[PDB]
Amino acid sequence: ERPTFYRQELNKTIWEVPERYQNLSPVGGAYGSVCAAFDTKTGLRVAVKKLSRPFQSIIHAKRTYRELRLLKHMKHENVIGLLDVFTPARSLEEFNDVYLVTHLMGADLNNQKLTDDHVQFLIYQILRGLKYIHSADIIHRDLKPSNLAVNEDCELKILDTRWYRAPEIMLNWMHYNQTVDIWSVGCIMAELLTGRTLFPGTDHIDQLKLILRLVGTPGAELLKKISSESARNYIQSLTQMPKMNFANVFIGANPLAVDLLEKMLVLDSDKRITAAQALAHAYFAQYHDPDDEPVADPYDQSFESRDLLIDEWKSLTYDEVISFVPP
């Protein structure tokens, strides 16, 4: 049973949506565009997204497929997930338009200190989601407060500025790792605790100079891992500063919070607490339940390596729209 659609003009496009999605009102840009709407079937407010030029080129088509595969996979309280995907077409031939439905979102996390219990609860939920995302072998790569939607009773989702980027990710470094997301978290936690941006770098070189000011220049165990002779030269061509005490930088913070930050904001990704080890840190003792912290089903990313024609990506996408199960 196909629903009944109606057609409607919004954001200088024509939209064709199942009748269960009522009064669409645009929210906003240059990507595919989003309308907020009312879902009558579930009673909820939803973000409907019209993908623009979904199959315009090959890169375009593969981008669409990636987005659908991703959302379709995320089945977890703290991560954003897919409520619905649909198309007007009746065959593959007539297939051109892909609309996605997810929870409409109250408040992302841009903004004044928070209480140490609020930070605990906020960071716990971010970590809960990262353990899940990480166990499907996915790296978020760009965590920052505006990817963090919280709602009225403070329940938080990860949605998909260089202020929160891991330095291995800024300096293109191959010695990356899932824990780039973790560096980001430290940068958010610190921001919530103090009220101020931990590294408000004005530009690329500033950014790294600020980071090296807090953590110190790389030890010896870290130099052993830099391959480029010039990179090595250049790193120790820099001002040789020591590591600062965090208790001094995080004055009047819970010493467990301070401890945790010292395990997250480390230059060497191989020595950085993982999401799962962080959920066990004493700092979250009030919230940690080791049976309420689920990992994901394994996630086939093999399509990433592939080079295919527009009509193969489109066909693959259609298969995924056909097969969608509502939650």
Brief overview:
The chain is of the alpha+beta class. The protein contains 10 helices and 10 strands. The strands form 3 sheets. Strands 3-4-5-7-6 form a 5-stranded antiparallel β-sheet, with no helix packed on it. Strands 8-9-10 form a 3-stranded antiparallel β-sheet, covered by helices on one side. Strands 1-2 form a two-stranded antiparallel ribbon.
Spell out the key features of this protein.
p38; Phosphorylase Kinase, domain 1; 5-stranded antiparallel sheet; transferase; monomer; Transferase(Phosphotransferase), domain 1; 327 residues; alpha+beta; signal transduction; 2 domains; 10 strands; 10 helices; 3-stranded antiparallel sheet; MAP kinase
Task: Set out the fold topology.
Layout: E1 5-10, E2 13-18, E3 21-26, E4 33-39, E5 45-50, H1 58-73, E6 84-86, E7 99-103, E8 107-108, H2 116-135, E9 148-150, E10 156-158, H3 167-170, H4 180-194, H5 204-215, H6 229-235, H7 246-249, H8 255-264, H9 275-279, H10 310-322
Task: Walk me through this protein's architecture.
It is a single chain. The protein has 327 residues and is of the alpha+beta class. It contains 10 helices and 10 strands. The strands form 3 sheets. The chain has a 5-stranded antiparallel beta sheet with strand order 3-4-5-7-6, with no helix packed on it. It has a 3-stranded antiparallel beta sheet with strand order 8-9-10, covered by helices on one side. It has a two-stranded antiparallel sheet with strand order 1-2. Helix 1 runs parallel beside helix 10. The chain is globular and about 65 Å long. The PDB classes it as transferase.
